[PDB]
Structures are given as C-alpha cells and as structure tokens.
Amino acid sequence: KTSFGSLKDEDRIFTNLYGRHDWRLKGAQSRGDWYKTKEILLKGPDWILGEVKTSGLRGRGGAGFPTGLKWSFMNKPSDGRPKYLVVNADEGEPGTCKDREIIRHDPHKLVEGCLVGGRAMGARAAYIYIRGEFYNEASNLQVAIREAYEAGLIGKNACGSGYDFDVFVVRGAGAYICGEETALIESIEGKQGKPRLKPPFPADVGVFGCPTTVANVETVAVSPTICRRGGAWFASFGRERNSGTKLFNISGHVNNPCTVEEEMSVPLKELIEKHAGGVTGGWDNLLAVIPGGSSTPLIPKSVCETVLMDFDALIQAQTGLGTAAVIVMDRSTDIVKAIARLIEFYKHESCGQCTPCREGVDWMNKVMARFVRGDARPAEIDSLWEISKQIEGHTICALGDGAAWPVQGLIRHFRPELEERMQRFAQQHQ
Amino acid sequence: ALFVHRDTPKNNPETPFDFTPENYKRIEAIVKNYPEGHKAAAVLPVLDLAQRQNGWLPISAMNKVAEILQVPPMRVYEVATFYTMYNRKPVGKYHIQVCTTTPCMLRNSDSILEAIQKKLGIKVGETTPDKLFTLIEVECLGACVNAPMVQINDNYYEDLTPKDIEEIIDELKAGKIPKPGPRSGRFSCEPAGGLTSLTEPPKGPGFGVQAGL
Amino acid sequence: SNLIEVFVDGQSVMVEPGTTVLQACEKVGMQIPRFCYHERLSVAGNCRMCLVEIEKAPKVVAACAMPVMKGWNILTNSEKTKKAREGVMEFLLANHPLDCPICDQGGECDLQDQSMMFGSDRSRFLEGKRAVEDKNIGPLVKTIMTRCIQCTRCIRFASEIAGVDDLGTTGRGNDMQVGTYIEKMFMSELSGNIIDICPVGALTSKPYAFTARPWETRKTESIDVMDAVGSNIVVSTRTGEVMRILPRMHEDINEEWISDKTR
Amino acid sequence: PFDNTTYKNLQHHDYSTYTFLDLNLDLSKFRMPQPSSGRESPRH
Ligand SMILES: NC(=O)C1=CN([C@@H]2O[C@H](COP(=O)(O)OP(=O)(O)OC[C@H]3O[C@@H](n4cnc5c(N)ncnc54)[C@H](O)[C@@H]3O)[C@@H](O)[C@H]2O)C=CC1
Numbered sequence: 042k043t044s045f046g047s048l049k050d051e052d053r054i055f056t057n058l059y060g061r062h063d064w065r066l067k068g069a070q071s072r073g074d075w076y077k078t079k080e081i082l083l084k085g086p087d088w089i090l091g092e093v094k095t096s097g098l099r100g101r102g103g104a105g106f107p108t109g110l111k112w113s114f115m116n117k118p119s120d121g122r123p124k125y126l127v128v129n130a131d132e133g134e135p136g137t138c139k140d141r142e143i144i145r146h147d148p149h150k151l152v153e154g155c156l157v158g159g160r161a162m163g164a165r166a167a168y169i170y171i172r173g174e175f176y177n178e179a180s181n182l183q184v185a186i187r188e189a190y191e192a193g194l195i196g197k198n199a200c201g202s203g204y205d206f207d208v209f210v211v212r213g214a215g216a217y218i219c220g221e222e223t224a225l226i227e228s229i230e231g232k233q234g235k236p237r238l239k240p241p242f243p244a245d246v247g248v249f250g251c252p253t254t255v256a257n258v259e260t261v262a263v264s265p266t267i268c269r270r271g272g273a274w275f276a277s278f279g280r281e282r283n284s285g286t287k288l289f290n291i292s293g294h295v296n297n298p299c300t301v302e303e304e305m306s307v308p309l310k311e312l313i314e315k316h317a318g319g320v321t322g323g324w325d326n327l328l329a330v331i332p333g334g335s336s337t338p339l340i341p342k343s344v345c346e347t348v349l350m351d352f353d354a355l356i357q358a359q360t361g362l363g364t365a366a367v368i369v370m371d372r373s374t375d376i377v378k379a380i381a382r383l384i385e386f387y388k389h390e391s392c393g394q395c396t397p398c399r400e401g402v403d404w405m406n407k408v409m410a411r412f413v414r415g416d417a418r419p420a421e422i423d424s425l426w427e428i429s430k431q432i433e434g435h436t437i438c439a440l441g442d443g444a445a446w447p448v449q450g451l452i453r454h455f456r457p458e459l460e461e462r463m464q465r466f467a468q469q470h471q
Numbered sequence: 472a473l474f475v476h477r478d479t480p481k482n483n484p485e486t487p488f489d490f491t492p493e494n495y496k497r498i499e500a501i502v503k504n505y506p507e508g509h510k511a512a513a514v515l516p517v518l519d520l521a522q523r524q525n526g527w528l529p530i531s532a533m534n535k536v537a538e539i540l541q542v543p544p545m546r547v548y549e550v551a552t553f554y555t556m557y558n559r560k561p562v563g564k565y566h567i568q569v570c571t572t573t574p575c576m577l578r579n580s581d582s583i584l585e586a587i588q589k590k591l592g593i594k595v596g597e598t599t600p601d602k603l604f605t606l607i608e609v610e611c612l613g614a615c616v617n618a619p620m621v622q623i624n625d626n627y628y629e630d631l632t633p634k635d636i637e638e639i640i641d642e643l644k645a646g647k648i649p650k651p652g653p654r655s656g657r658f659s660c661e662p663a664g665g666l667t668s669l670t671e672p673p674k675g676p677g678f679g680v681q682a683g684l
Numbered sequence: 685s686n687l688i689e690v691f692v693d694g695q696s697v698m699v700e701p702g703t704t705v706l707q708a709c710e711k712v713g714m715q716i717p718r719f720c721y722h723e724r725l726s727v728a729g730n731c732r733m734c735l736v737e738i739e740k741a742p743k744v745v746a747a748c749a750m751p752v753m754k755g756w757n758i759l760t761n762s763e764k765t766k767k768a769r770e771g772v773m774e775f776l777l778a779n780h781p782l783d784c785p786i787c788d789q790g791g792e793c794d795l796q797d798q799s800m801m802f803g804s805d806r807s808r809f810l811e812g813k814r815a816v817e818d819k820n821i822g823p824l825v826k827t828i829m830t831r832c833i834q835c836t837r838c839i840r841f842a843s844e845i846a847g848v849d850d851l852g853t854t855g856r857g858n859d860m861q862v863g864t865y866i867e868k869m870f871m872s873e874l875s876g877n878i879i880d881i882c883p884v885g886a887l888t889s890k891p892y893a894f895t896a897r898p899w900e901t902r903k904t905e906s907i908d909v910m911d912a913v914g915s916n917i918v919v920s921t922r923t924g925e926v927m928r929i930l931p932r933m934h935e936d937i938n939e940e941w942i943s944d945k946t947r
Numbered sequence: 948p949f950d951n952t953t954y955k956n957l958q959h960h961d962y963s964t965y966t967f968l969d970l971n972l973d974l975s976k977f978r979m980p981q982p983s984s985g986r987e988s989p990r991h
Pocket residue numbers: 100101102103104105106111114131132133134137220222242243244255336361362363364438439443
C-alpha cells in the first residue's frame with residue numbers, strides 16, 4: 042500500500058470508542074472481547090510475544106519502542122521474585138485524552154490486555170496506575186474488573202487456563218511526572234513520583250524491586266486483538282516500521298475536536314479535514330499544528346500539507362509522533378502565549394529531582410514570559426536555544442526533553458515573529 | 472501555597488482526626504493490594520482516603536497515615552506536598568478546577584475563568600465566604616477534545632460556555648448535583664456534527680480470528 | 685578473575701563488574717566533578733554534574749550511577765563532557781545566591797571550586813533568583829536554604845547512617861525545599877556530619893559560624909578523646925586558637941564521621 | 948434493536964466519593980495471596 046488512511050469500521054480495534062454501546066461484560070463479549078482468551082493463554086508466552094513482534098506494534102505511550110522487543114525482556118527464568126505488568130493509565134499530556142476513552146468505554150479490552158500481556162511476560166498481577174483525576178473512569182474500570190473476576194476471567198484459574206493473574210488499580214494523585222514509567226513505579230511504591238535512573242531498566246528492577254513492564258493502555262488493549270486477528274493483520278496497516286492503527290485526539294482550532302481511531306500513516310491534513318471538520322476559518326487559516334501533544338515540536342502550515350502521521354515521517358519532519366494528539370492552532374493565535382503557557386505547564390509538572398529541569402525549565406518559563414511581552418532582545422533567542430540544548434539530553438527522564446522541544450520548535454519556525462514582538466516592545470516603550 | 476508547616480490552632484498534631492471503622496476496613500483492603508513487606512506502597516491511597524473522609528489534610532491525617540502504615544511521618548509529608556490533590560488547607564465543598572493549558576486556552580477557557588470569577592465574586596485561589604466554592608487554576612485534566620472544561624470534586628464538566636458554567640454554579644448553590652458531561656450536544660468525545668466513524672455495527676465474537684487458535 | 689577491560693581516555697583499566705564509570709575514572713587517578721555522589725551515601729544521580737561522554741554513544745551518562753560495560757572508552761575531557769559540566773554548573777548557579785563573602789563555606793566550597801574548574805566564567809541568567817525560608821533544625825546546624833542545591837546528601841545521610849528519617853524534600857520543581865516540613869529539631873548523635881557532606885553553605889556549623897575561614901587555618905591531625913573510639917580528627921587552629929574540629933578519614937574507625945560531642 | 952443514538956455509559960452519574968474504595972473492598976475477596984519479601988518492611 043502507498044497511500045494510507047480511510048480505515049474501515051470492520052478493521053477497528055476500539056469499537057465502542059464513543060460510549061455508544063454497553064461497556065460492561067455482556068456488551069464487551071458481544072463485540073469480540075474475551076473470545077477464545079483461554080486459547081490465547083494456553084499457547085505459551087513465546088507464541089504471544091511472537092504475535093506481538095510480528096505485528097510491528099510500537100509503544101503507544103509516545104516513545105514508540107517496539108512492544109514485542111520490550112515485552113520479551115521478561116521472557117527469562119524466575120529468580121524468586123514475582124513479575125509484574127504495570128499499565129500506564131496516567132495520560133497527563135496536553136492534547137491527549139485517548140486512554141480516558143479506552144478506560145471509560147472499553148475497559149474489558151484493557152483487562153483482557155492485562156491478562157494476555159501478563160501471560161506473555163509471565164507476570165503475576167496487573168497494577169493499572171490510573172490518573173487520580175480520572176475518578177469516574179477508575180470506578181468504571183473497577184466495575185469491569187469485578188465483572189471479570191465474577192465471570193472467572195481473571196484471578197484464580199483465569200479463563201480456565203490454570204494461570205493465576207490479578208488486576209489492581211492504583212489511583213494517582215495529580216502528577217504528570219507520574220506517567221513516566223520509573224516515576225510511576227516510585228509512585229506505586231508510596232513515594233514521591235521521581236523518576237529513577239536507567240539502568241536498571243524496570244525489567245531488571247521495577248515495581249517493588251521485581252521484574253516489571255510498564256506499558257500504555259493502548260499498546261496493552263490492542264494486544265488481544267493482535268492475538269485474535271493475527272499479527273499480520275495488524276502489520277498490514279501503516280508503513281513499514283509504522284504498523285497498525287492509532288487513536289488520534291484532534292483538539293484546538295478545528296471545527297469538531299474529537300477522538301478517532303485511524304490507520305497509522307494517515308496524512309495530517311486528511312485526518313483534520315475528514316474527522317474533525319477542518320481548521321476553523323479554512324485550511325488557509327492554519328498557523329501551526331503541535332502533532333503529538335505538548336512535548337513534540339510544532340510544525341507550520343508548509344509541513345502540515347504533506348506530512349504522514351506516524352513515527353518516522355514526523356521524525357523526518359524534525360518533530361515527533363508522541364501520543365498522536367493533534368493540537369491545531371489557527372492564524373488568530375498568539376503562538377508565543379501558547380508555547381509559554383506550555384512551558385509554564387512543564388515547570389508546574391516537574392518533580393524537582395535533577396538540576397537541568399528543576400532550574401532550567403523555570404528559567405525557560407521566565408524567558409518565555411518575557412518573550413510574550415517582547416521584554417527582551419534577539420540575542421536572548423539563541424541563548425534560549427542553548428538553554429534548551431543544556432536541558433535536553435542531560436536530565437534523568439525525558440520531561441527535560443519534552444520541555445526543551447516546544448521552545449526549539451517555536452524558535453526554529455517562528456524566530457521572525459519573536460523578533461518583531463521584541464522590536465515593537467522596544468519601539469513602543471522607549 | 473507554602474511547603475513548610477506552621478502549627479495553627481486548627482492545624483496541629485492535636486487536631487482531632489481519626490478514621491471511621493468502615494474506612495479502616497477500606498484501608499485493610501488497600502493494604503492487601505501490595506506485597507507483604509511493602510506496606511509503604513499504601514501511602515497514596517490511604518492518605519487520599521483521608522482527604523475523602525475529611526475534605527483536606529491537617530497534620531493529624533498525615534501522622535495517622537504514618538502511624539497505621541508504620542512509615543516515618545516525613546515520608547507522608549513528602550507525598551502530601553508532592554502531589555497537587557492533597558489539600559493541606561481546607562477547601563470549599565465544591566472545588567472548581569479550571570484547566571488553562573494550551574488545548575483549553577485555545578478554546579477560550581479564559582472566558583470561563585472570568586465567568587466563575589465574576590459569578591462567585593472571588594478570584595483564583597480564594598474560597599467563597601460560605602465555604603462552598605474554591606476556585607483554582609489547574610493544568611491538563613486530560614479532556615482536551617472536550618475543551619473547555621472544569622473539574623468539580625470527581626466530575627468533568629465539558630464543552631462549556633460561560634452560560635453553562637453559570638448554570639452549573641447556580642444549581643450547585645441550590646443543592647442539586649449536575650451531570651458530568653459535555654454541555655454541547657455530543658455525549659463523550661465524538662465529532663460534534665455526527666459520527667465520522669464507528670457508524671457500522673460492531674462485528675462480535677469470531678470476526679477475523681486467525682486459524683490455529 | 686572476572687575483571688572486565690574498560691578505557692578511560694583511551695587508557696586501559698581492569699575493573700570489577702558493577703563498577704560505576706566514576707570509579708573507573710577514579711582508578712586511573714581522575715576525579716569526576718560531583719555534588720550528589722558521596723562514596724559513603726547511596727547513589728542518587730540527581731545533580732547531573734558527573735555527566736561524561738562514552739564514545740560512540742550519542743548521550744552523556746551519569747557516571748556516578750552508570751555501570752561500565754565491556755570496552756567503553758570514557759572521555760573525561762571531551763567537548764560534550766565539558767559542555768555538560770558547564771551547562772549543569774550554570775543551572776546550579778542560576779538561582780544560587782551571591783552570599784560567598786557572608787558564607788562560611790567560602791574558601792572550602794565545592795560549588796566555588798568546581799565552578800572555577802569545570803564551569804563558565806560568567807552569567808547568562810537575566811532573571812530574578814529564588815529565596816527560600818530558613819529552617820530551624822537545631823542549635824548546631826545553621827540552616828540557610830537559599831544556598832541549597834538540592835543534592836539530597838542530607839536525606840541520604842539522615843536515613844542511612846544516622847537512621848533518623850526526618851529530613852526530606854517537600855514540594856515539586858523549583859520550589860522543592862529540603863527540610864523537615866515542621867518545626868522539628870534534627871538532633872542525632874551524628875547530626876553534625878551533615879555539615880561535612882553538604883557541598884555548599886546551606887548547612888553550616890553554628891559554633892563555627894562567622895569566626896574563621898579555611899585558608900588561614902592550620903590543620904593539625906590528632907585523635908578524639910571524648911569516647912574510646914579514637915576517632916581521627918583535624919583540629920584546625922588560627923593564630924594559636926582552636927577554631928574547629930573536622931574528621932579525618934580512617935577506614936577502620938570513624939570512616940569519615942565524628943559524633944556531635946567530638947565536633 | 949441496534950442503537951447508536953444514546954450514550955450507554957450512564958453509571959458514572961451515580962458515583963459517590965467512596966465508589967472506588969468500596970469496589971476495592973468488594974474485590975478484596977477475589978484476589979490471590981500476596982507475595983512476601985521475607986520481612987515486615989525494609990526498616991526491619
Ligand atoms: N502518553 C502521555 O501522556 C505522555 C507521553 N509522553 C511520551 O513519552 C516519551 C518518552 O518516554 P521514555 O520512556 O522516557 O522514552 P524512551 O527512551 O525511554 O523508552 C521507551 C520505552 O522503551 C523501553 N526501553 C528503551 N530502551 C530500552 C533498553 N535498552 N532496555 C530496556 N527497555 C528499554 C523503556 O523502558 C520505555 O518503556 C516522549 O517521546 C513522549 O512522546 C510524554 C509525556 C506524556
């Protein structure tokens with residue numbers, strides 16, 4: 042296939058994405074969920090890991106690590122310690138609200154994904170670290186887990202396979218940094234959500250000291266559909282090394298902000314004008330698109346005309362795919378006010394552990410707050426660039442990178458607008 | 472907004488806090504979710520339970536969570552001051568949380584923040600004199616396609632206009648509890664002018680299942 | 685022997701498995717700059733001053749925490765190592781207060797010394813700094829928390845060596861404060877040693893406060909007599925008057941600590 | 948009757964402040980016995 046997009050409704054993983062069907066167990070089993078789960082479990086860990094490696098599933102959390110390669114880090118003998126699958130249901134990214142829709146509307150798909158994935162990785166239980174702000178979704182998920190226990194689908198002799206597997210839900214308490222997998226581990230362990238250093242990776246030392254795989258809600262929930270439909274079905278969508286389907290959250294300055302499941306390498310312009318009704322005021326009213334939530338660099342209108350919405354074509358467009366959360370910004374936007382608000386978010390959501398983020402993200406927020414007013418000089422733009430290059434790569438987790446990249450995208454694509462802002466400040470205040 | 476504690480007469484280690492017995496059974500069920508020997512992993516739920524029984528956290532809820540989990544009290548103080556939900560001051564009975572990040576600021580959450588301010592007569596951080604409404608300004612609540620939106624105590628009120636949040640505040644003052652949903656026409660997250668996808672009926676069990684399973 | 689071969693600046697050195705990159709550089713006689721690493725505290729890795737380049741690797745690694753792999757060529761003096769050191773030092777000095785004359789740590793400050801050694805020579809910080817409320821943790825340890833670089837040597841010492849578990853970090857981000865969160869008094873029997881390990885004048889000795897200055901002190905190596913441990917100490921004098929008592933390192937007695945009575 | 952016009956997820960309009968914790972209290976009977984580290988806490 043050469044052009045991508047226009048996904049059919051029969052080829053959807055997240056049926057009942059919109060809350061239009063029964064999310065409970067009798068509705069979920071009537072939509073293909075929990076069907077032949079025992080036959081998936083009995084074929085061993087190696088078969089399930091091979092079906093995930095065949096499918097080409099990458100990490101839907103946003104970094105895009107190969108999911109089968111990541112989950113095969115647990116295919117190793119027991120050293121006395123138990124093993125844990127941990128579902129990352131935090132979703133603190135601005136723009137991103139897809140995991141809320143999975144937990145709220147397809148919860149049994151997440152529970153079956155916990156069972157199948159923890160069977161693949163030999164795990165003992167599933168700790169679903171859900172966001173603390175998602176209370177109704179957490180009780181929603183707990184109702185589904187009660188329905189899964191009472192049907193014998195999980196717990197003692199899960200689905201009649203002789204495999205014991207629990208599913209726990211831990212609520213967060215209001216920290217974006219607790220979506221980072223090691224800080225999420227530290228938050229489950231009852232401490233401040235500060236990220237660990239790597240190595241040890243969580244497959245070696247994870248939650249409680251155990252072998253542990255943290256994986257996103259989407260990359261876990263699509264795994265029983267990969268096991269039932271086959272890995273080649275999932276690899277038959279999107280470009281090569283960009284396989285599958287993907288949830289997209291188009292918000293901001295579009296006519297109909299919405300969540301949509303779409304084929305992987307869909308064009309951005311087609312996605313916006315097909316599922317969201319296009320940019321408000323027309324496509325010529327488009328100023329910028331933050332393609333994948335707040336951490337990715339923005340791209341202007343001259344990149345959004347031709348770009349594909351997968352990992353590799355956005356890396357080649359000097360941005361990232363991230364969480365596939367499309368924030369659309371029209372010509373009426375003070376883009377410096379939006380990016381400075383985004384940097385303000387990253388200094389409010391920063392755990393204070395290491396030096397470059399703790400100091401430099403606040404220092405970038407002060408510089409961006411002066412750039413909104415134009416209370417600066419153009420030699421501070423390049424300086425700000427250097428500050429971002431001192432935060433990027435030198436921090437413990439990638440929130441320093443995710444704070445550096447909006448600054449770098451704004452400078453790289455809108456340096457003249459910053460310079461005219463500052464020179465008009467200078468000529469109206471002197 | 473501070474991160475050191477000073478003993479007021481209403482916030483001290485002699486402030487009366489204690490769990491109800493049904494909350495003690497809830498704490499037992501919480502601690503049974505974690506391995507034997509890692510009881511400290513129950514700091515974040517139980518302390519949040521102390522915020523649901525009491526409304527806020529004095530420094531006797533923190534010391535009680537420290538005592539019943541056999542953890543040092545500083546390890547509960549760190550959790551209480553790290554995570555933004557734990558109210559270390561008393562908030563109003565309805566805790567209005569306006570999201571003002573970029574996907575909501577682009578869809579005019581400023582007008583709704585102004586509407587709540589000019590309605591309640593307060594500003595951000597202040598509590599109304601009847602102790603019913605506390606207005607603060609929070610980061611991304613994870614409901615970005617339903618922007619603009621607020622959170623009240625469990626609930627997301629979404630796709631709001633200033634009239635809609637005025638009406639929600641009017642019926643919160645009247646005692647009723649509103650419906651946590653988008654105040655526009657749509658239901659959860661669909662496109663607002665009809666479904667662009669998932670119009671066909673879902674297939675059901677057995678569809679597309681590979682051979683050898 | 686299961687010793688693996690690693691390279692520090694191209695020089696071969698045989699290390700035990702599980703050796704950190706900092707210890708591999710230390711075996712060839714090179715000291716990596718550090719603020720949170722302390723060889724008797726647990727590894728935190730939260731100051732990023734130890735970031736060193738491994739060659740053919742497009743990312744500096746925290747040398748205090750990263751174990752060596754077989755055949756890494758550690759580049760202690762390469763360009764991106766020096767840029768990492770200068771950037772991290774600039775972030776350490778952005779919100780740090782201009783207290784060097786009124787600070788007791790001056791002349792014996794790690795932040796001063798490896799600002800001179802590994803950082804830039806000027807500021808690009810065109811903003812206002814933070815100021816932190818001072819804490820009261822006793823009549824021994826003066827506390828000026830604007831000078832704190834949040835290296836958590838406090839907390840790791842009080843948790844692991846003193847067994848106190850009362851120091852900690854409150855808050856999040858640039859407002860993360862090291863303290864006890866309450867009006868609580870940190871009085872162990874080893875509570876003075878947090879003055880030794882604090883690389884800045886955030887925690888200072890209140891009896892030694894303002895009285896002397898380390899370049900004019902004569903360091904007489906001597907023995908404690910307050911207990912029967914025989915802790916090796918430095919008596920530092922100035923113009924024939926005893927100014928303070930510091931610890932000496934003896935691996936078999938007092939490793940590098942002394943009690944509060946000795947101090 | 949195929950319905951694609953009404954929002955079937957209406958249960959969270961009746962969740963109180965203790966819905967999650969009472970669901971955890973209910974689910975406490977379905978669960979496997981926890982593993983043991985071999986000590987009461989890492990300060991033991
Ligand atoms: N979904 C959300 O709400 C948010 C998502 N993000 C995304 O998070 C991304 C950053 O995530 P990170 O995990 O920090 O990036 P990445 O460097 O670490 O790693 C991605 C995954 O691969 C695994 N991995 C990579 N190399 C490995 C190795 N050698 N051994 C074992 N496991 C290995 C890690 O354990 C991790 O789970 C950003 O690009 C952003 O798009 C960021 C913020 C919020």
